A = this chain, B = another copy of it.
Amino acid sequence: DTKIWNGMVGELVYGKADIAIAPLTITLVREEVIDFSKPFMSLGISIMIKKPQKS
């Protein structure tokens, strides 16, 4: 609605913060306002299920 970045990106856009070191997943629209570095930690959607029981 407001098209205002909240969170850590809006602290970088509006000059509140100087840099961000955080678990920040790189999307396109985040790069449209600020600059990422290279992805140091590649990941994705994993499948968390239970562990086979000791019954």
Contacts and interface: CB of A to CB of B under 8 A. Distances in A.
Copies of this chain, complex-wide, total 2
- Give the most central of A26, A36, A38, A39: most B CB within 10 Å: A38
A42 interface: yes
Interface residues of A, number: 5
Interface in A2-38: 26, 36, 38
Contacts of A38: 26, 36, 38-39
Interface of A: 26, 36, 38-39, 42
Closest 7 CB pairs of A and B: A42-B42, A39-B39, A38-B39, A26-B38, A39-B42, A38-B38, A36-B38
7 contacts: A26-B38, A36-B38, A38-B38, A38-B39, A39-B39, A39-B42, A42-B42
